[PDB]
Structure 1
């Protein structure tokens, strides 16, 4: 049960859940390379989400909805995390490290680039830890769709569960900071600082979607995710 895990068991489950770092397939279509990278990461994000404690307790519908809302925020927070020790650069993959003026190739990409670097600098200033990072990523998964669901009794029960798991991750975040020797005030301050960054990740994702949907296939992402989440039980 996801709600009976301790803070240490929670951190431990999220670390264990971490997806692998994938590699990119001169400047070809840089958008080609990045889209191919994202598509391959999506698969591993599905496996990952299924290991976030609480997630597989939800309906298939709500699982898809959550990933459809959060997929870019999740990709972005991973990017920001990887790029943390590389100032002025975004490590999309170990073999695809781009700087600002490489961004000025796709129109509109520069604005998003600058925002991503700034978040990465912020994580670096705060010395964000891996254990904290995985907590934030899981919050993104669980939080980003919750407000834009139906309100059936089933749907109400689903929303209550999500808020219990989010409360457990908060618990876990606080436990980490205490385990790291911060004061209670410092803990509350750091918790606030990190959750406010989630607002900026949401903002970037929204601008990202605008940018991506400005470039005009017959395979909608919803359908894509459903197909991937809706696994059979034949391969035991």
Structure 2
């Protein structure tokens, strides 16, 4: 039961469940590169989700729902995290470091690349730590689709309450980390807020990215990658 984990047991576990590092393998060519990478990452995201404290306590239907609702936001936060140390660049994969102008290969892509670069620059100046990063990524998984759960079932309501309590623990964990980092109580509250407010920006970029992917899909410029198509369809 995730509710028993201590702050350190929570973080250490999240850090150990991190997905493995993957390498990537015109407008269509660009879209192919990104969608191919996302499809492959999704397989590992599913394995990772299973290890997020509390995720497997949910019904299979609810696990599916959370992943359908947060997948792109999770790929994106991982991307801004990797891109931290590379000012002005987006590190999609160790062998795929793209500059802002690279986004011009695709109509409407520079816009989202700019938002991604902005968030990365933001995490950099804030000096986001990996312990914090993994907590944020888990929060996204749990928070995104919880309010879209059915409200017409006692079991669904209990599922929502369970997720909310696990989310509370992750909150204590984040506070704990900032505490030992030497932050005052005021700095802790402020930093926790800044981080959670960024999650709001990520949800926005994800929504914009999704609309972009669907529009390209419609232009038939998206390869038939079955899992990616499944996740896209869920939106």
Instruction: Compute the TM-score of the two structures, normalised by the length of structure 2.
Output: 0.91
CA deviations on 1:65-100 (whole Å, 9 max, x unpaired) are: 100110000000000000000001000001111111
How far has the Cα of 1:147 moved from its partner? 1.2
**Separation in 2, partners of 1:62, 1:55:** 9
Contact 2:71–2:231 (CA<8 Å) still a contact in 1? Answer: no
**Separation in 2, partners of 1:146, 1:14:** 20
How far has the Cα of 1:151 moved from its partner? 2.8
How far has the Cα of 1:26 moved from its partner? 10
Structure 1 pair 124–169 and aligned structure 2 pair: CA distance change class (3 A):
same
Contact 1:89–1:100 (CA<8 Å) still a contact in 2? Answer: yes
CA deviations on 1:154-178 (whole Å, 9 max, x unpaired) are: 1001000000000000000000000
Structure 1 pair 105–19 and aligned structure 2 pair: CA distance change class (3 A):
same
**Separation in 2, partners of 1:108, 1:165:** 37
Contact 1:64–1:226 (CA<8 Å) still a contact in 2? Answer: no
Structure 1 pair 118–227 and aligned structure 2 pair: CA distance change class (3 A):
closer
Choose 20-29 or 162-171, whichever is displaced more. Answer: 20-29
Structure 2 counterpart of 1:141: 141
How far has the Cα of 1:34 moved from its partner? 1.1
Q: Secondary structure at the match of 1:91?
A: strand
Report the count of equivalent residues: 232
How far has the Cα of 1:179 moved from its partner? 1.1
**Separation in 1, partners of 2:212, 2:17:** 30
Contact 1:112–1:204 (CA<8 Å) still a contact in 2? Answer: yes
Structure 1 pair 46–204 and aligned structure 2 pair: CA distance change class (3 A):
same
Contact 1:2–1:54 (CA<8 Å) still a contact in 2? Answer: yes
**Separation in 2, partners of 1:212, 1:228:** 11
Structure 1 pair 193–218 and aligned structure 2 pair: CA distance change class (3 A):
closer
Choose 20-29 or 214-223, whichever is displaced more. Answer: 214-223
Structure 2 counterpart of 1:106: 106
How far has the Cα of 1:102 moved from its partner? 0.7
- Runs of 4+ aligned structure 1 residues displaced above 2 Å come to 216-231
**Separation in 1, partners of 2:171, 2:231:** 29
How far has the Cα of 1:228 moved from its partner? 11
Structure 1: tracts of 5 or more residues without a match? none
How far has the Cα of 1:33 moved from its partner? 1.3
CA deviations on 1:99-130 (whole Å, 9 max, x unpaired) are: 11110011010100000000000000000000
How far has the Cα of 1:226 moved from its partner? 13
**Separation in 1, partners of 2:164, 2:6:** 17
Structure 2: tracts of 5 or more residues without a match? none
